[PDB]
Symmetry: C3
Subunit: 284 residues, 3 copies
Amino acid sequence: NGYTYEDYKNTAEWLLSHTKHRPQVAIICGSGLGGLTDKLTQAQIFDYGEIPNFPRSTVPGHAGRLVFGFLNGRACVMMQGRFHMYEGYPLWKVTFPVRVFHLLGVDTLVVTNAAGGLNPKFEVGDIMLIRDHINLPGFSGQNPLRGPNDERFGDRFPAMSDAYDRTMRQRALSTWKQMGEQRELQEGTYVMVAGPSFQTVAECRVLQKLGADAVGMSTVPEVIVARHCGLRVFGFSLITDKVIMDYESLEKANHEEVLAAGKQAAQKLEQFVSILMASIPLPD
Amino acid sequence: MENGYTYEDYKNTAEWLLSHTKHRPQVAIICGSGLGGLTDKLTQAQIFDYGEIPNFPRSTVPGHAGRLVFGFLNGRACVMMQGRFHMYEGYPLWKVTFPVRVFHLLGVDTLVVTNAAGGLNPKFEVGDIMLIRDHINLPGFSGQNPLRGPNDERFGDRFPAMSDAYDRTMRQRALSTWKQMGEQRELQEGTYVMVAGPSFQTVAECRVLQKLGADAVGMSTVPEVIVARHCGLRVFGFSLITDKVIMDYESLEKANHEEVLAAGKQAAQKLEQFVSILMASIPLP
Amino acid sequence: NGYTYEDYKNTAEWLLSHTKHRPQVAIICGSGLGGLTDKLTQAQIFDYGEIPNFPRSTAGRLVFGFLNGRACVMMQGRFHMYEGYPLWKVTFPVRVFHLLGVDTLVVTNAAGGLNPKFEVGDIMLIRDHINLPGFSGQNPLRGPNDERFGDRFPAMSDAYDRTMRQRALSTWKQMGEQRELQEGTYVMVAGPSFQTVAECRVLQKLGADAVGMSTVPEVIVARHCGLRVFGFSLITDKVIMDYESLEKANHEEVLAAGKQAAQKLEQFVSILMASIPLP
Ligand SMILES: Nc1nc(F)nc2c1ncn2[C@H]1C[C@H](O)[C@@H](CO)O1
Ligand SMILES: Nc1nc(F)nc2c1ncn2[C@H]1C[C@H](O)[C@@H](CO)O1
Ligand SMILES: Nc1nc(F)nc2c1ncn2[C@H]1C[C@H](O)[C@@H](CO)O1
Ligand SMILES: Nc1nc(F)nc2c1ncn2[C@H]1C[C@H](O)[C@@H](CO)O1
């Protein structure tokens, strides 16, 4: 780490005194999903470069930004452009915003990401309800909680066996049935690899053997610190391509480029997340 | 893993301890969480707080400031470590394992490691003692190994074997002593997997750990063993099974009433006295 | 962290302006496999400390010359993660090689055999890898990315060139070797300590045929560059995968049949210089 408690406190206070908005729900937008910010109403934008203590972008493109607003009526703060480990950011920098949300008064975090499908059943365009995760950087020392614990946020050894709220998963599955979509809402485990290189077949086969249903390079760090803080969490992976799980099928690659989330697939997810704002319990 | 210790640092600490106690230990014992009461069983003891031992890894003042206790346990010359350092607290593994090299230079030829651990093996129940037969070093697979950096042939080889980390003679004698103690529970035996922590495992993760063949999980010990064997120390150890980790979502919902408590003060005491009794099975130098 | 695009380019040009050699192929020889440098004609030697921005080997040199009709740059005494080196130093030469004009990289290493079939002395055509360190964050591509080198998210499914594997096999049959050319997956572990039986068993279960502490970082950045890659593991020992055959110890002497065995792999890399495509 390198952030004092006061640092987080100072940022949350700064935001609070520059917006009349008071979010209950924070939403991290994954790659190709930033258009969720367009669905906010009465929106107020802050560029990261404007918010004190916020990690500076070293990356191509605009810095990314924090959008306060209402989403189907819900007080939300929305994150467009997350920090990734593969870009050389320490997890304590990646996850900083989650702690600020907590101090902002947020009690719920929704996480979205794009992911390669490991599960034969999954097809490009599917949305996966995240049931559970496998944190490989975590096993080996790369866990955002590393260092002295601050009891003002949470415990030394927080549980993650229950990180994906039972109630919101039951309600997502329920709300999805009224939507009348062609494909059922998938559910499974997100495995986080550090990237940025992509899997070899051999590696794709381990990830499969480890029970992971979909792979990507983000999210878990955030979820973990959310649960440390006692935030309610749920989330979705957009399956942007099927990873090749053998050499036979490796040769059979033809009219191919692992494209970003089909703009229509992204838009389906964005509007599902929006509609689910109806189903989060109110703080009260 | 950027080792800020010269050989002369280790030697300076070792020699400092050697000129402030008359004790000359053969055996080092690392006390796991909740097992520190082992030190009370030492006779003719002497205490050094980490704070007064040059080059010893420094804290930011939490509740438990650890210490080293020299003395005789069941007749054996011992140095005993109460309060270990953990990776998850932010310490580099070269700080975690610094004491093991000091012990070598003290003249120790045997390291015993104790810890508390989650039970992965269905057969294990809360309060069990597991003889560590082997380990799986997940941090080591990815660069986080305490031997990372140059090798110093004055400690050991570049590429030390870990096939035989947990001494065979002592494992047979552990299992032997236990049988004639006449205990209600069988002495368990299996593989300890190190995960870096500090967050606990999800169900999915707990499953991988099972599939990897691990019988118990914790966040320590493996670093210390590895640098012990690099020095040629005899190693043996135990995990006290503190809780059983949930390994299916079905039993996750049913997880209602409770939390992962510390080592039940009774079961710890049982281990602590088994360790004392096993002092008479360690070979002489 | 570490090296900018200029730095690579300055190193490349220094070498270009300090040798008449213009190499097409680069060969990173592993442990005990550097005798291949003696077979180089017109050989021109550079110690690493001599070269701008190079990592200082703290017995490491760069050798240019012709092997079996091919302009080569040879690396004797590679960098290892266990030695304390960060992966961006480990893989620094691979990009210089690219800016030198090299289009093929051949990698050799010493490995422990996880596949029961494998015997000491076997050569393994590396067909694929498992980068265990890379899962957790130790990946040489981590950090800012320059597109003059390659993509942000490069593929590694075809890291080991289809054509050269077919030609390795083809030459091997032509060589009339009694022992078959093994082929499989190399898992990179960080080291330096060797595997426990428990750990060997997970590596086996993971699908790895051979284990070592190098190579993968180089292959990854080479492919990020668009270099053609093929490589070999010499099986120096069968890794103990149970406790029964841990008791059983032997007429110990892993070493000196490893000369005939390392020679075989060296002479095979030589032969294969004729099978690498031209630019
Ligand atoms: N097989 C795969 N592995 C990983 F790690 N990511 C994959 C992927 N396939 C697609 N993706 C998408 C998801 C991320 O948004 C983006 C990387 O940040 O690429
Ligand atoms: N499921 C579990 N996973 C891990 F890593 N550790 C567990 C655990 N259950 C109990 N413990 C014990 C080990 C230490 O004594 C203490 C803190 O690491 O808690
Ligand atoms: N002095 C030299 N100059 C050049 F241009 N090539 C040399 C050489 N000595 C050996 N060779 C090798 C490389 C050519 O591919 C090959 C001739 O086609 O022989
Ligand atoms: N059983 C084994 N396990 C691991 F990890 N590596 C092994 C090995 N046998 C040989 N090696 C490789 C790696 C060293 O860098 C190199 C020593 O020269 O040989």
